[PDB]
Amino acid sequence: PAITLESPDIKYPLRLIDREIISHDTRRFRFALPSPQHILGLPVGQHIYLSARIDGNLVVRPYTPISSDDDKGFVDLVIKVYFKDSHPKFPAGGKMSQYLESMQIGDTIEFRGPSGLLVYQGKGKFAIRPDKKSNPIIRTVKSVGMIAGGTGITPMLQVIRAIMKDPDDHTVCHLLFANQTEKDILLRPELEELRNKHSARFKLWYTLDRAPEAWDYGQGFVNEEMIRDHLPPPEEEPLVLMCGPPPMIQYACLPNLDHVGHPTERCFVF
Template sequence: MEQTLMFPVLIGLVAVLATVLFLFMKTGNSESRRKTSKLPKTLQDPSVKYPLPLVEKEDITHDTKRFRFGLPSSCHVLGLPVGQHVYLSTKVNGNLVIRAYTPVSSDEDQGHVDLVIKVYYKNANPNYPEGGKMSQYLNDMKIGDTIDFRGPNGLLVSNGNGQFAIRPEKKSDAKLRKFKHVGMIAGGTGITPMLQLIRSITGDPEDQTKCSLIFANQTEKDILLKKELEEVVKNHPEKLHVWYTLDRPQQGWEYGTGFVDASMMKAHLPPPANDVLIVMCGPPPMIQNACLPNLTKLGYDPQNTFTY
């Protein structure tokens, strides 16, 4: 009899604790956003260049590194809206070189900004014997050296809770759109804007937007930020689905093989709908020859697709 009476009491206690935990997380997230919005922002004007010093450099894979740059103070945040990127600029052999990058850090991180960048070395690829000018320059930087940052830049901003402000062109006004599910296709270093968006969505208990990601690479060792992605999947399986595909998989590989195609999209992306957004970032041949034609073939509205 006592066990019968205790059972509903225990259920009630569990329900109360779950409610308290949810409210705590919700309040904490709102407080965090309010706190962040009051912190000094580094990027005050997108037309101004801000020299930032390299404070740390770490190997991520055989050809990819994380570069950490210091902000003006330990209280500063970068001031980059989710969905936006920065431009880095410098002179290499007397010529101005400018490249766009999406940080893997966010405005939750104070005092620094992190970039994960693949270094294209000289003579590593016969098609590009000179390698990457900016990536090699960054690789050669010493701790304390500075490089110019400029931003925010980009045609897409995520406002949270599935609301996006998207500009079709640079000079056009942003259109506010609401989406319940975001499908993502990334190739190589194109994962960085996806991770930025994924972390923003999954880090907010109030945001019920779902994300589905197809991530294409040449080999398993080329997969960037896999540990970070798997951690998000583990903590938020209801919000994030990830499917990897490799050009040259090793024996025992459990995910996809080959280029991104229509059947892969159909299996791992949300089906076409007005509340579905598809975002892409990767090598131009992948976007032009694989992603866009197959999205059209499957019936996705071009107004509901976005290429970084």
């Protein structure tokens, strides 16, 4: 099979072939690989880099795909667009996300990778480099806790999809997914389809900054009780994965993980 990202030092221009509106500000962007028989070449859990020249600046941003090496001919990204003239303190908006939003079908952008400190090697085995300098440390776990906000769902879905497609993978994933309003719950159909098909290995819970009137899940920021009730208990010695805005990690996740009893050595932030 042909690998797209043959070298991590080479930038590969890929063409946009599809673009799906997921919410008011978030899209799934599908790019064609060099041939329909190509695969991306992305170990489970890692990310890529997009680069482009935008107004005299060389903009480089990382993005974690939701597709896998099982997907021939394409790669899927899920990107939130930081629109201009929308936020008072940031009137110019975000550079890369608005550039992607303006891309027409067929337009190209340079991909590079893979990159990242975590790789899922299957059957509960996670290879995590303690820092950018060291070799990966292997620890096998029976369950994984997952806290995501917004597009932080993308690395989690990469791991969830890899586990569920293997019938001999008995790892159990518990996902706590936090967003602002109900319309901001990205990839809800895909998540609930996986939960309804693999309910013994996949537990799923939402919280919202502002919930609707009829709401069966959580309301408010991630807190101590949500982690206690919807992540695996610390006695199982699970791995706890996190992806979201740095302030949500700093204020909502890390202190409340300490409160429940999940040690820092068993936690990882994408």
